[PDB]
């Protein structure tokens, strides 16, 4: 259960843009700075940056 520390304003149709305070179900990540998360609201996927999130 990670948390968006920064407002990600993605501009592509792949990564989902989120805001601060929004929770994101992290999926796989432990090598680069880009991880894949899944929002528990609508049920979609969106690669969220690690600099805009952290374990909390």
């Amino acid at each position: 259960t990670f948390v968006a520390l920064y407002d990600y304003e993605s501009r592509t149709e792949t990564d989902l843009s989120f805001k601060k305070g929004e929770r994101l179900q992290i999926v796989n990540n432990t090598e680069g700075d880009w991880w894949l998360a899944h929002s528990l609201t609508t049920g979609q996927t969106g690669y969220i940056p690690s600099n805009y999130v952290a374990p909390s």
Partner: peptide
């Protein structure tokens, strides 16, 4: 994939 420029600050 240059990471997003953190909010200036």
């Amino acid at each position: 994939r240059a990471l997003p420029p953190l909010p200036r600050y």
